């Protein structure tokens, strides 16, 4: 309640920082160890659990280095020596994150992780990605880094162990910039690779390291997706575009799921209202120059057509307006078209004498 009148002056030296962390970027690491079991969030270096082994300490310190800014937060999950990965994945479903990495893994467990990521992206429509060692997955949510025997300091780090540094570097990059041709100071040398083999390997769709210009740098920022459908785009291979698209998709959830799920009758008028709301949201993103102008939001015609054909509806002799007016039970189909600018990666200069 009311106390005696108080005058207090406080002095604080809020200037103890360097290489400040970005607001975006969350990395989740799951580890096998005998101690410190459970989730142990790591905000910075000073708060590191002491009971962990040397290998986990090395992996965490590798993951603690960014490109320009340090990652916002680290979620370290510790599992016992003999355990299944299903419990860790089910626990992580509750938490939210951007990237997930596994330093120590086997061939079969990578398959489980890839299947989980695919199911989460498609069935549940939650946009997360994972960085894996040698997985040949054909999905944009999978990143495979396939160079071996990285010599950081005096240790021949394995590919799976260096996936941690790869994930940290990816999370550290700002939105405007990309991860192409970024130099790694710590790395000393790479096993020999000829130029044409590296070019073909990255063409197949891979994350590699090469020695070009002054020092070692990442060849390209492509994804694991290697085939393109008519619906899918060539811009979906770039990591930066996918990151921006997933940021936008996660952001629109506070408009969609917060209010329009379970609280509003599913009528075509309400669909039009929701479309207007989404477009008005996209205008603000356009005005901040995050995406390009002229972004359209409208009803997904083809998916709605497929759903209507799934049930007992004779799609013949129906007007397009009549198709759009149809009530699709309790589900809504929407489609948006937005453009993201890529970074400069190729230059063609011609000089006339």
């Amino acid at each position: 309640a009311i106390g005696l009148p108080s005058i207090n002056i406080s002095f604080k030296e809020l200037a103890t920082t360097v290489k400040e962390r970005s607001a975006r970027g969350i990395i989740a690491m799951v580890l096998k160890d005998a101690k410190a079991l459970g989730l142990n969030e790591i905000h910075e270096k000073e708060d590191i659990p002491v009971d962990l082994s040397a290998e986990n300490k090395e992996y965490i310190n590798l993951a603690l280095m960014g490109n320009v800014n340090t990652p916002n937060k680290l979620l370290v999950y510790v599992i016992e020596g003999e355990a299944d990965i299903q419990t860790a994945l089910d626990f992580l479903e509750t938490k939210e994150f951007n990237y997930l990495c596994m330093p120590k893994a086997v061939e079969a467990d990578k398959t489980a992780i890839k299947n989980w990521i695919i199911k989460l992206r498609d069935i549940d429509k939650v946009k997360v990605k994972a960085v894996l060692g040698k997985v040949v997955g054909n999905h944009e949510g999978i990143i495979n880094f396939t160079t071996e025997d990285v010599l950081v300091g005096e240790k021949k780090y394995s590919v799976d162990e260096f996936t941690s540094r790869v994930a940290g570097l990816i999370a550290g990059t700002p939105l405007s910039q990309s991860v192409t041709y970024t130099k790694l100071s710590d790395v000393v040398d790479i096993p020999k690779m000829t130029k044409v083999d590296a070019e073909s390997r990255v063409n197949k769709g891979e994350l590699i390291l090469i020695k070009e210009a002054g020092a070692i740098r990442i060849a390209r920022g492509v994804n694991s997706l290697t085939e393109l459908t008519a619906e899918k785009g060539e811009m979906f291979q770039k990591i930066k575009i996918v990151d921006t698209l997933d940021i936008i998709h996660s952001d629109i959830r506070k408009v969609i799921i917060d209010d329009y799920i379970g609280k509003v009758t599913n009528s075509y008028d309400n669909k039009c209202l929701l479309i207007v709301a989404i477009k008005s949201y996209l205008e603000e993103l356009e005005k901040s120059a995050l995406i390009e102008s002229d972004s359209t939001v409208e009803i997904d015609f083809e998916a709605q057509k497929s759903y209507l054909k799934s049930k007992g509806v004779d799609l013949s002799y129906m007007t397009l307006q009549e198709i759009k007016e149809a009530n699709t039970g309790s589900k809504v189909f929407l489609k948006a078209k937005i453009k993201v600018l890529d970074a400069m990666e190729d230059i063609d200069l011609s000089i006339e004498i």
């Binding site: 008028d269 039009c272 479309i275 207007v276 307006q321």
Partner: protein, 136 residues
């Protein structure tokens, strides 16, 4: 062939359906300047911009406009709204919807009544940008 009748007209204002609406109208007026070019008798024009204008007419069922804008007008901050108009005549083949954005109202009518006459309210407004849904 049939021409749509205005009886089948609905209006959404600020996300709320307006039950009583007699008529709705929105127009875009262009700005042109006369330019005379040497050697030509005919006079040409250059297009320099446009203005959005319109109005609503609705019965005095409730005090909607006051609850919308009254206190904010006094305080000194002017609100902007979005209105949707739908015209779907069953005889005609298709429907038409338009979204009007960045609406600002010209005036506010506190009270107006006369003996033997049902009350009517009309409020002109000006807008900037529009979006089209369900074109014909």
């Amino acid at each position: 062939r049939n021409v749509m009748s205005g009886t089948w007209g609905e209006l959404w204002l600020d996300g709320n359906k307006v039950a009583e609406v007699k008529k709705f109208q929105a127009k875009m007026e262009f700005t042109k300047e006369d330019i005379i070019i040497a050697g030509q008798m005919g006079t040409d024009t250059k297009y320099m911009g446009y203005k959005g204008k319109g109005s609503i007419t609705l019965y005095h069922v409730s005090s909607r406009m006051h609850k919308l804008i009254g206190e904010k007008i006094k305080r000194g901050s002017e609100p902007r709204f979005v209105a949707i108009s739908k015209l779907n005549d069953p005889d005609s083949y298709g429907a038409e919807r338009i979204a009007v954005k960045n609406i600002a109202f010209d005036d506010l009518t506190l009270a107006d009544w006369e003996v033997g006459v049902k009350g009517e309210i009309e409020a002109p407004f000006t807008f900037t940008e529009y979006d089209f849904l369900d074109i014909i």
